[PDB]
Amino acid sequence: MYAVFQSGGKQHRVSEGQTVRLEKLDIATGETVEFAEVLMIANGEEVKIGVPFVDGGVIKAEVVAHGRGEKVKIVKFRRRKHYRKQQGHRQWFTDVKITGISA
Amino acid sequence: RLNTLSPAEGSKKAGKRLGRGIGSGLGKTGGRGHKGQKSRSGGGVRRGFEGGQMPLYRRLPKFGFTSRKAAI
Numbered sequence: 001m002y003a004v005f006q007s008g009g010k011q012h013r014v015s016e017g018q019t020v021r022l023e024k025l026d027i028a029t030g031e032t033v034e035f036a037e038v039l040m041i042a043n044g045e046e047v048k049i050g051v052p053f054v055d056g057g058v059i060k061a062e063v064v065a066h067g068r069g070e071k072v073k074i075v076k077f078r079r080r081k082h083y084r085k086q087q088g089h090r091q092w093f094t095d096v097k098i099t100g101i102s103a
Numbered sequence: 104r105l106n107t108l109s110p111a112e113g114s115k116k117a118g119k120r121l122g123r124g125i126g127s128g129l130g131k132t133g134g135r136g137h138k139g140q141k142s143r144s145g146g147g148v149r150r151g152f153e154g155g156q157m158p159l160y161r162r163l164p165k166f167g168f169t170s171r172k173a174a175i
Contacts, residue, residue, distance in 0.1 A: 082131055083125070084125050084126075
């Protein structure tokens with residue numbers, strides 16, 4: 001029981017009952033999210049997409065966390081040119097829990 | 104309210120500090136460039152000096168005189 005869907009420009013392989021950290025979405029922290037753009041629905045028998053976004057498949061997930069990613073330091077330094085620059089970044093994420101996969 | 108008085112916006116510049124870090128901008132000779140007469144402490148040419156060329160106040164001629172009557 002697993003499916004592949006594209007949400008934030010990248011495809012995620014998720015099975016039933018597991019949480020996946022994906023790109024932040026303008027959505028509430030406790031509202032079920034619907035993703036009708038699913039690439040494959042997998043079972044004992046395999047069904048493949050003759051055209052993108054299957055025919056009636058959809059992914060039902062619930063948002064869990066809306067925090068930020070780990071600290072990453074961006075250090076730019078030029079050798080012998082009296083130049084160095086410091087910068088930090090923390091990419092936002094919206095963790096969701098995959099609770100239901102349709103056919 | 105004594106600890107509330109603040110200066111008007113734009114009334115302070117904070118100045119410029121030379122030779123203080125890399126991100127401060129004008130450091131490492133702080134805005135006077137690499138080797139040269141200007142880069143040395145106490146350097147620079149006197150007023151009107153044109154690197155040996157005759158200054159304007161030397162190439163131009165004198166004319167007229169100061170009249171004491173005009174001062175009274």
